[model samples]
Target chain A: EVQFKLVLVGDGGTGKTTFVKRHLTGEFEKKYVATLGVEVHPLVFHTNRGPIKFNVWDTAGLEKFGGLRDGYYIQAQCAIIMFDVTSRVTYKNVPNWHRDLVRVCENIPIVLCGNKVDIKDRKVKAKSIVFHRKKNLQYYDISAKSNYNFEKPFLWLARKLIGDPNLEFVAMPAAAPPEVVMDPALAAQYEHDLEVAQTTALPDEDDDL
Target chain B: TMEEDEEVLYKVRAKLFRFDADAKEWKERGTGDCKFLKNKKTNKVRILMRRDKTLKICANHIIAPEYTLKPNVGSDRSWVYACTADIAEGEAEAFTFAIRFGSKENADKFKEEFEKAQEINKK
Candidate 1:
């Protein structure tokens, strides 16, 4: 089995963490608790070709944590740049994020994900396909909550990184849970905060459509 | 210069970078004393390097009210780490610079102190 480090970068509230969570747990989380730092998740996929382990890094998007992001981006073989389709500002900042990533880790495969596509009141004016083509980036319109085309990006990246065009794949049996390295108290606190945020009756706090 | 009885929460030996106009790039001049200074009167976070008996400081020079510091992401163990503040408006880039810390612990300590300073300053 080979290991690959993949990073997820985008503005906060763009559903990067939710995508990873759903892909791992197969359940959607509804709440807007920002990622504090980089959360590392190890996922093992049993493909037709072979087993692959992905050490996925989910980075914080708040401007305050911007300095920490470049470190996470370093040495990453592939990345997913995401944006909220309901938020034009997030969409507009995609190029800036792309530029920053290229500056830090150039020549790596990057996939652009337009998130929250299931939202009815969309605000993004256009999707610049030309830019993606020019940058040699793969673009996908996906909803993290619905798990739309979620595996395609990771599968594409795995295939690209492994240099195997015909790498057929299958869902592997769930691996035993890895040892918990995160601070247990902090993890519990985050879980409590997410549950609180999700259960709140406030309309704006409802992250799921 | 620090005040008497002032507490230094963190200190690290780091190479400072300054933009060289002729070369148009940031060059490391030399090592300096980088510290987080807090006294009863004020909190001073700065990097001090002396040249010809003159001390140059990069404190209170941030273009924004808030700043951030983080460790070097990759295995490059050189003193280089990342810090983000604001650059001058319309400078075509946000304020992000790298400082080389002598050790990872010091770098992490600096990040914690820098974060604490931001919180204290906010109040």
Candidate 2:
């Protein structure tokens, strides 16, 4: 089984965790607290050649947690720089993220993902198109909510990692299972917080428009 | 400017020891201020102190993953920590030496920094 280390980097509240949670488990949470340090999730997909395990690291995007980002980027095989199409600030910060990533892990494959495509009147469309073309970057417009082109970024990364564009595989079991290894204490706290938020039915607070 | 760029996380007076093969015990070799430096780009760690113009431990030479820091057993306000090295073959088992800190808090800080550096090394 080939193992690939993948990292997700972007500004906070850009739906990075939402993307991972939705892709790993078909459920999306209306509210998610900021990641403390980093979250590790192992996902195995059955491809035509064999079973490939991807160790996806969802990194904290807040500047306060910036010190910890380097630890996550080290030795990463590939990365996805994501931004919310509805938020122009997040899109503008993409270059800063890209620069840091290139400094730490050079020559690795990177995919640019414009998230929240379901939201109309994208603020990032014009700039993203020009930047993608100028940088020769692989760009994918996706919506984590509507599940449009959601798997395309990961599939493109996997193919790039293997250097085989022809590689193809049917996702085994139809629904991929969520496998996360983290501190038991922290995991319990996350569950409790999630439960409390669900019970209260709090309105989404990250709607920073 | 380079030194400023290479921030020193922890610097404190400590005792350095080297194993004496014939004596079959660790001997006090040097006593000076130990400085832990962090690299900006790679995020690797290195240690430096003056033996002869500040003998240095390159980030590549220091094995951070195998490091351990703990309180000095049966001692008050003292701490001890060990970090291994990638050295030539046939080196003494004492290649893994200990740094004795006068304060437990400094030792703990060093340990935390060492672990962070090692976490980067693991990846």
Candidate 3:
């Protein structure tokens, strides 16, 4: 029954909802309610320790209330600021989102996620996505459609929030279906993509910024 | 687009850095075109730099008289300076910038223009 308040941020069309909705059809409950430029949803994760829940607060595209929207960010333990990599403008606005989030949350674990990794065109180099390094925020490149690096952000947040070193997700046994289902090629792609994601690292030495 | 009102006094392709108070070392802020922009109406000068590929603002602050650009150790093409930058998105932030130029000549040119900018802001 451990709970944490997680906030979602980015530009309006940056697929904040799409990223969360990837879990909509799964075991997590459907509590999609947009209240005052904020969508609060409960995301439950299964682990050997127990079920950990994230009370996710998502922005509902109310652009005018830039200053007032900090109301949703208050008391948030962690946050994921997502942007569409395909839309460079969305990526550009990430600093503004970071400013707003940190102004309220202050020293919380925040992940800077670049969404829509499936699209090959107009994506900038991975090295250029250096905002996280400059600010020391954990970063992940994700795709809601391809399901690439989707749960890694959650996993990163979970470990930091729970302060667990050996955290691992326990997959619940299916009701009555194939024990394993996947095309070999697709499985290889998953393995390679996961390896690509798992190898990313970060930071500076003593007496530094 | 507001920069259209100001002319570019000094433009150079350079890499920028910010001192990390926690780590006590310089971290790479971004690589971009750093420029000294002079306002036409007010006759003030400021620095504005955006990460080249992504267009993210790495540094945006006025060149005040109190600011001094110090030469980084053993490097003629690099500088370490502090400024209260307005690029914090919503508010201004105090940043210790360690910027690097491609050549010593460009670095010196930037320093001269920066001094000129400080003088302008003083008036």
Candidate 4:
């Protein structure tokens, strides 16, 4: 009966809501929309070790609704501040979101998740997350659509929240690469676009040739 | 001309000289967590530093990822700040440097001042 509360926070167009919807319902929407209010979803799963529940909240990116942040964070066990793979500005906004959580939650277990992993073309990258070097923060690359290693870290999070050290007994399989064979030209173009998107400076690496 | 630009934009003092500046040639300094610009300006100038054959250049000195010198804008110490806005790597709670100006002259001055300060402390 271990319960874990996971919250997703990111900038307006960073796909916080989509990540949640995709995880819960196994769906994908090409459109982008800013989250207005917090969306709550209760996910229950049975692992080899035991049962865990995720009282996850997808909060809006607006600071005006700072009040909603606490409702989700209050008595929360774990949190994940997510950013879109395509939007570096969303990645840049991570500190603000992270600070918001820390001011209220005080050093609770936090994971910095770069969502939209399926978008290899518009990849956000683990290096960006590693840039912050937040302490006690675990990093993971997940794609909710292809059912990537999303559950592994989520379950590990639940285990951590419940103080169940033995929960490590449960195991997940290895991740499989996406099926899509992007055209070499298209892939190269995406890489080029991604490089431009990564840093604010002049483009050094040729993303795609 | 490069020295003049640093002076106008950042008030940095870089010595001017007659040499192959090679404005087209650019080299990246630092790497990964900390990257910087260098050796695009005059090659003979050394006010900020003596020109080097290996990689002599100037940097626009964007301070986003590296140690930010100041947190605010249009402030007195803005140029002296080491961390521009925020520094990602290093001790969680640490004191970093700030350059009032991000120009080559300021970098040179900072180095000189640091050496002087260290020498003074030695006595």
Candidate 5:
């Protein structure tokens, strides 16, 4: 079984979990709990070439540790540094992010993903791209909402790490939801909230369409 | 009654930007060299940051009478998910952390802090 570890790092509300969930299970939700410490998800795939597994670690954005969460980045294969395309400060903090990663990951493979590209109205200035590239890092202008050509960065990191072209087929599937492990009262409240949220948020026009 | 979480506020100052569709680009409109032109139509944009479910604004300065992006009302406590701050130069951002529903007491604490910090540096 081929196994790989990928870490997602960014400031809070950068949609780190959303990106992983959508790619792994085809489920996307705008409302998400801020990741606490680290949530590990396993994705198993059965492709024509072979079997491969991806162990993706969804991390809490800076508010949790304020770019001080070094313990979790150790032993990661590659990292996706995420930032909001709309917010310049978050974009400005890219250097701080890179600094933290290099301290722990030691110049590991990195791909910059400017998330929330779906909201075209909100984007980093075009000139900023050239400026960022001058810093010597790979960049992917992506929208987790549109899934806008996300596979490129994902595949880039995968191939760089494993060097296997057809390696995606072997992983079993997107890991199932972490068993609803929480206090019963908290779990009940969350379940009720989720039910209400999904029922009201789903597209009514979709059933009609 | 549930425990009331203090409404944390800070001095937030920002330079707002607008997207120009015709030229297909973004241009700064407020609080900068870019003056608002009559020919330009711009979207109201701001940066928001948060932890857990609590949301707050952090732009190094804050303006008064700004609008909230997401105002959430619960049975006891109400929280605004997003708020607007005037992109004014040399403005202060301040607010009382006391949370009582429908109360707006936001003030600029940025200018005050800046002056204090500068005074200390001169000494």
Candidate 6:
């Protein structure tokens, strides 16, 4: 059984805990105890190659807590820093957490994950999330409400750890169809919107501050 | 500058795009009022578009006799066409253009008028 020790760090209430817990139980964790400063949650994914476990070091993200910071990150092979798309301050706190992570676990591949993009009242826009590119890190936008697009994120970690380019996960029969209840007309609009966003020179609400 | 005695064959607010030969993909050039202006004396129709503000010419060329508009695969309010002598920046070059109209009615009218220009250019 291959195990990859990874750390998930982000601002408190930015859905750091909720993201991982939802993988096990699609139910949301409404409140935090705050006592479990840095906890371990072993999440597993079964791929065609074999089953791999990610011993996720889920930090409680209380900016006040100084509990076991360096020790928890010890022997970490990789990390993922999350920020709520609906919260601007939480996104700003990413660099602080990233600095703390890199200070301890040097030379580890890190990923930036912006969560809750499905929310309508989201504050942070797409072009401004520069932390990923600023640090040469891989970035993704995830919807915790519907983690239907949650498969590829895990595969990325596996490929990085093994340093292999040719590894692929054969499709499971149960996952034969897509998870999102997509409508025909609605699906084409989103695809076109994505293409437009990529090709057009959109108005800069404001560049990175 | 679009000159005197030039009749506006068709005018509508639309977005202009160009097939980027270097990048090998489509890209938006600008948003502007696209108008087909036909010079009465010369009996020639030209496609001219100036960006909304600052009045910079975004797309400029004449509808060649051989010009033909290609329908977008999925959208009815969009069209793609190519011209060999586009003079947008006072320079001539070939540009494959994709224009999107706001309404299906306007798109249909544009197609009819474009083919009309094509017939006139032939003679």
* CAPRI class assigned to model 2: incorrect
Lowest summed lDDT window (length 10), candidate 1 chain B? B51-60
Backbone clash numbers for all candidates listed = 2, 0, 8, 26, 31, 0
Over the stretch B36-122, how does candidate 4's per-residue lDDT look in tens digits? Answer: 212233211111321111112212222222222222222222222221212111112111222223343544554454444333323
Q: Please tell me which model should have the higher DockQ, number 1 or number 6.
A: 6
Mind giving the per-residue lDDT tens digits that candidate 1 earns over A1-209?
Answer: 89988889989999999888766534356768898878999866657787888899999888876558788888888999999889988877888889988998888999988898788897874544345777899988888755566677877887898899887555232111111123445545544433332222221112221
User: Distance from true position, residue A165, model 3, in Å?
Assistant: 2.4
lDDT of 4 by residue, A1-209 (tens): 66777777767766667666644533344457666678789865555566677888888887765456656677777788877777788888888888878777885788777766768687566655674474567766665444455555575676677667565433221111111223455545544433322222222222110
The residue ranges of model 2 lying beyond 4 angstroms of the native Cα positions read: A126-128, A171-209, B1-123
User: Scoring each candidate complex against the real one, what DockQ results?
Assistant: 0.01, 0.01, 0.01, 0.01, 0.01, 0.02
**Tens digits of per-residue lDDT for model 5, A1-209:** 67878888888888888888655534345566787877889964444344456788888885644333767788887888888888887778777777887788885678888888878687577568553465556788876665575555666676666676654422222111111123445544544433332222112111111
> How do the residues B1-123 of candidate 2 rate in per-residue lDDT, one tens digit apiece?
134445666677755444333533333333446666666656655565422111222111343564444433333333333334322112312232445556657666766766776676566
Kindly list the interface RMSD, in angstroms, of each predicted candidate in the order they appear: 25.8, 26.9, 22.3, 23.1, 20.5, 22.7
What pairs collide in candidate 3?
A: A207-B23, A207-B24, A208-B20, A208-B23, A208-B24, A208-B25, A209-B20, A209-B21
Cα deviation of A179 in candidate 6 (Å)? 29
Where model 3 places Cα greater than 4 Å from the true spot, the runs are: A26-36, A65-68, A173-209, B1-123
Per-residue alpha-carbon lDDT of candidate 1 for residues B1-123, written as tens digits (9 for 90 to 100)? 333535656666654443333533343332346555554454533332221111223321321223334333332222232223222111222222445555656666666666776565455
Of the two candidates 1 and 2, the one with more favorable lDDT, higher being better, is: 2
* Residue B117 in candidate 5, Cα distance off native in Å: 76
Q: After superposition, which runs of candidate 5 have C-alpha atoms over 4 Å from their true positions?
A: A45-49, A65-68, A131-136, A164-201, A204-209, B1-123
**Residue A23 of model 5: what lDDT?**
59
lDDT digits (tens) for residues A68-145 of candidate 2: 877789999988888888999998888888888889988888888888998878787655555656565699888876
Q: Encode model 5's per-residue lDDT on B13-120: one tens digit a residue.
A: 232222223532222222211111111121111122211111111122221222222222221221221112221211332211111121122112333333343333
Task: Give candidate 6 misplaced runs (Cα > 4 Å).
Answer: A31-35, A169-209, B1-123
Q: Work out the TM-score per prediction.
A: 0.51, 0.51, 0.49, 0.46, 0.49, 0.49
